[PDB]
């Protein structure tokens, strides 16, 4: 299990700022191998996994016809 950070900030001389939150839960669930072995015959010992990662990652912050080309 791990948790995220990542504030950002971009300033021109656009001016945006992004910040989110990571998330990660990568677990071997040996319970599931046991359960799957409590079933019509499946005699295995291969592991199990439960990665549940995710994030949020919020965000916070012409001349259509400038008459120069006419009369070429």
């Amino acid at each position: 299990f791990v948790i995220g950070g990542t504030y950002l900030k971009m300033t021109e001389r656009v001016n945006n700022t992004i910040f989110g939150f990571n998330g990660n839960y990568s677990t071997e669930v040996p319970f599931l191998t046991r359960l799957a072995n409590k079933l019509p015959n499946i005699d295995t010992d291969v592991p199990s996994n439960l990665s549940i990662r995710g994030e949020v990652a919020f965000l916070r912050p012409i001349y259509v016809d400038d008459f120069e080309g006419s009369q070429s």
Partner: protein
């Protein structure tokens, strides 16, 4: 018949130049290309070539060679230039494949070029692939799941959604080959699809398709031989071609990743003062050097790049020098920007990617390639029905 590569002795700088700069052998069905290599003799020898279609596992497929070609195989390389006005005299051979003899290569799939030397004896042989376009290999690197092997692994996940080739038995027909940068030795091949959610396959797991990160390639650019350019200090000319001594590298596995860009193995033969860089570059004994005091095993550190096929011959084996506790070996190399890396080998061919002397940092910029073989059970060969390139500047964890 697992026909494999064969490293030469005289011939050096063997590559597959396409559209100018060097490339990896993966080629399109009608893309032109060459096989520029360079003999280290003024002898304008006669190098007859060949081409052979091959299976997934590189057993030579049983097609008649009148079927995957139109023309000839054994005919000596017409075009070749001699090293003009250089210290190391060499004969630059070169052959375009849509040439006079084999006027095209008419079937996708694996191949193996042979450069047998004037009688029948294969001097060398390189492998390439001529991939056809029928699938849409949508790939993307992404960080692994297992938290232990997550800071130094790069899972690879993708699909194959073709609207041109209806797959017959995708679990048994559609075999896939995964290449880390352009290397054929560390490919993660022989992988069955997980899902097959429709007409499109989907490969998603993190057991097989999981490459070691591996740190970035080192380099050195001796554009001009007698210069003191990028980390080539103490260049000394002594009764021979020039000697380019490189700064003693350091094992980077025990350190943190530092943004250090490369071109993923490729070298750039080039010089200043030269009109045509191919026949006017000059070989130069470069003395490599590794200072890895943490490295202590019974495996051998081989030098490796794209200039030498990522090969592991004894002419690239680093050597421990007890006087300095520093590996070292000379390797004659043409001029120009050249990448490389120190890849341990087990003792014969086993690379041992983990525990590499450079590192395995998950965030390194590798360019993974995916080739989708395919064989209907009426066909006489394994096609290649599309590749999808996806590098690791997008590790979408």
């Amino acid at each position: 018949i697992q026909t494999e590569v064969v490293p030469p002795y005289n011939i050096k700088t063997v590559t597959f130049v396409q559209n100018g700069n060097n490339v990896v052998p993966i080629f399109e069905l009608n893309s032109t290309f060459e096989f520029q290599f360079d003999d280290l003799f003024g002898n304008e020898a006669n190098y007859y070539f060949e081409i052979t279609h091959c299976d997934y596992n590189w057993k030579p497929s049983d097609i008649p060679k009148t079927d995957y070609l139109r023309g000839f195989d054994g005919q000596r390389i017409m075009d070749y230039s001699n090293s003009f006005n250089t210290l190391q005299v060499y004969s630059h051979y070169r052959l375009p494949f849509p040439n006079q003899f084999t006027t095209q290569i008419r079937l996708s799939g694996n191949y193996i070029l042979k450069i047998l030397n004037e009688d029948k004896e294969v001097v060398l042989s390189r492998k390439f692939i001529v991939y056809e376009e029928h699938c849409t290999v949508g790939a993307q690197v992404k960080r692994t799941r297992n938290l232990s092997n997550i800071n130094y692994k790069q899972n690879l996940d993708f699909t194959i959604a073709s609207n041109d080739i209806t797959f017959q038995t995708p679990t048994q027909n559609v075999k896939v080959l995964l290449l880390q940068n352009g290397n054929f030795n560390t490919a993660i091949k022989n992988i069955p699809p997980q899902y097959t959610i429709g007409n499109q396959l989907v490969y998603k797991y993190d057991a097989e398709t999981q490459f070691w990160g591996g740190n970035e390639f080192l380099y050195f650019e001796n554009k001009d031989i007698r210069a003191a350019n990028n980390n080539v200090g103490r260049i000394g000319s002594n009764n021979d071609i020039y000697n380019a001594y490189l700064y003693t590298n350091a094992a980077r596995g025990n350190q943190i990743y530092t943004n250090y860009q490369d071109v993923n193995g490729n070298f750039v033969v080039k010089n200043i003062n030269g009109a045509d860089n191919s026949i006017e570059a000059d070989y130069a004994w470069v003395y490599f050097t590794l200072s890895a005091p943490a490295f202590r095993m019974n495996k051998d550190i081989y030098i490796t790049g794209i200039f030498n096929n990522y090969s592991l011959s004894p002419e690239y084996k680093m050597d421990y020098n007890t006087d300095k506790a520093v590996f070292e070996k000379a390797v004659m190399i043409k001029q120009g920007f050249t990448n490389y890396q120190y890849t341990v080998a087990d003792k014969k061919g086993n690379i041992d990617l983990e525990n590499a002397i450079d590192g395995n940092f998950y965030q390194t910029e590798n360019e993974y390639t995916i080739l989708v073989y395919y064989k209907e059970s009426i066909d006489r060969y394994q096609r290649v029905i599309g590749k999808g390139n996806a590098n690791s500047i997008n590790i979408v964890n």
